A paper describes a structure:
Here we demonstrate that Sorcin binds doxorubicin directly and with high affinity and that it changes its cellular localization upon doxorubicin treatment and limits the toxic effects of doxorubicin in the cell; the low resolution structure of Sorcin in complex with doxorubicin allowed the identification of at least one chemotherapeutic drug binding site. The asymmetric unit contains two dimers (A–B and C–D). The structure contains 10 Mg2+ ions (3 bound to monomer A, 2 to monomer B, 3 to monomer C, 2 to monomer D). The superimposition between the Cα trace of doxo-SCBD with the Cα trace of apo-Sorcin yields an rmsd of 1.11 Å, indicating that the structures are similar and therefore neither Mg2+ ions binding nor doxorubicin binding are able to promote the conformational changes induced by calcium ions in Sorcin. Inspection of the Fo-Fc electronic density map allowed the identification of two peaks: one close to the EF5 hand, which does not bind calcium in Sorcin and is responsible for dimer formation, and the other close to the D-helix connecting the EF2 and EF3 sites at the interface between the two dimers. We succeeded in modeling the doxorubicin molecule in the first site (close to the EF5) whereas it was not possible to model the doxorubicin molecule in the second site (close to the D helix) indicating both the low occupancy of the site and the flexibility of the doxorubicin molecule. The binding of doxorubicin to SCBD in pocket 1 involves a stacking interaction of the drug with the aryl ring of Tyr188 of one monomer and interaction with Asp177, Gly182, Phe173 and Phe134 of the two-fold symmetry related monomer at the dimeric interface. In the second putative site (pocket 2) doxorubicin likely interacts with Trp105 and Phe134.
Sorcin is one of the most highly expressed calcium-binding proteins in many tissues, and part of the 5% most expressed proteins of the human proteome (PaxDb). Importantly, Sorcin is overexpressed in many human tumors and MDR cancers. Upon calcium binding Sorcin undergoes a large conformational change that exposes three pockets, hydrophobic surfaces involving the EF loop and EF5 hand (Pocket 1), EF2-EF3 (Pocket 2) and region EF1-EF3 (Pocket 3). This allows Sorcin to bind and regulate target proteins in a calcium-dependent fashion.
Numbering used by the authors:
A (entry chain B), B (entry chain A): 32 to 198
Write the structure that this text describes.
């Protein structure tokens, strides 16, 4: 028996599967939230999107074990940039946190990411994770259309929507 | 002159310019929502960044006027398929609604949208807008970069991300 099984277990027992609504309950039950403002649902939608890989709208347990790790990894990397444990982070001190944990972008590119997600000036922990989660799946999408291994991908119109809207 | 000024006037004189928290209000104040539930703020950042080239987190009244009209039209098509007055519409009903209002999307593409934005087999009115919103701002970005005029645009990894994280 894995410890993370139980949180996942009690929510949606038979399918062996959880959607965003099911996912949200069991994350914050297990305290990956970890003191901070517990994950709201439209964040959890992306997490599901990221990891289903079949358009199921759901992810099973070993897909769930995988997630908990990524969010722990990212949770601590947040706590570095807000050791006061307020909830928040200013956009510029966020700017570095973005660059650090990998696969990063230029000072001109990074701003775009902190411009959009800046909620009343500050950035929330929920906004932070939700940004990471959105990008990971965008990298992982870009990856799989970049069969050439270049870092430059041709996008048709219908393909570009079909891609971007799924995440 | 214009009846839409009062609703807008009430919400902000930041300059003569509103944010999402304000926009949310004046929409529901104007009752474009129209029986259905107020457009929630998760949607109403899209509505800013859709018509915000200058990354301010703001739109103005003349931009607003565009928005309200697009919605008044979009809303109408929804209410074709929702003679219920329910706030819910099936993902076939959605697929056809996307066609009739002028989107060049394939069988495979709208499937991949409809799948995503559905949650228990039907789509909320709020969701249908945020789907429709997202389309029209991503296609405006694709046509912004398609001065190739081909139906194909080519994307660096640092450009592809900074495109999709703005919306
Ligand atoms: C999210 O991860 C990825 C997933 C799939 C493909 C990619 C990447 C990726 O991160 C990536 C890069 O970070 C870089 C490049 C790249 O092609 C990719 C991917 O293709 C080259 C680069 O010049 C580009 O601007 C083009 O994207 C800059 C950068 O170079 C970095 C990493 C290079 N491998 C090399 O070590 C160079 C010296 O620094
Ligand atoms: Mg799955
Ligand atoms: Mg701080
Ligand atoms: Mg305000
Ligand atoms: Mg503007
Ligand atoms: Mg119906």
């Amino acid at each position: 028996m894995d410890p993370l099984y139980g949180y996942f277990a009690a929510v949606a027992g038979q399918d062996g599967q959880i959607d965003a609504d099911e996912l949200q309950r069991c994350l914050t039950q297990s305290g990956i939230a970890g003191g901070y403002k517990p994950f709201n649902l439209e964040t959890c939608r992306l997490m599901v999107s990221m990891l289903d890989r079949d358009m199921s709208g759901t992810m099973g347990f070993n897909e769930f074990k995988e997630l908990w790790a990524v969010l722990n990894g990212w949770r601590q990397h947040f706590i570095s940039f807000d050791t006061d444990r307020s909830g928040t982070v200013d956009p510029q001190e966020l700017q570095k946190a973005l660059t650090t944990m990998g696969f990063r972008l230029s000072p001109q590119a990074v701003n775009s990411i902190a411009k959009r997600y800046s909620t009343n000036g500050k950035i929330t922990f929920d906004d932070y994770i939700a940004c990471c989660v959105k990008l990971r799946a965008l990298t992982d999408s870009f990856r799989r259309r970049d069969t050439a291994q270049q870092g430059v991908v041709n996008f048709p119109y219908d393909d570009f929507i079909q891609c971007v809207m799924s995440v």
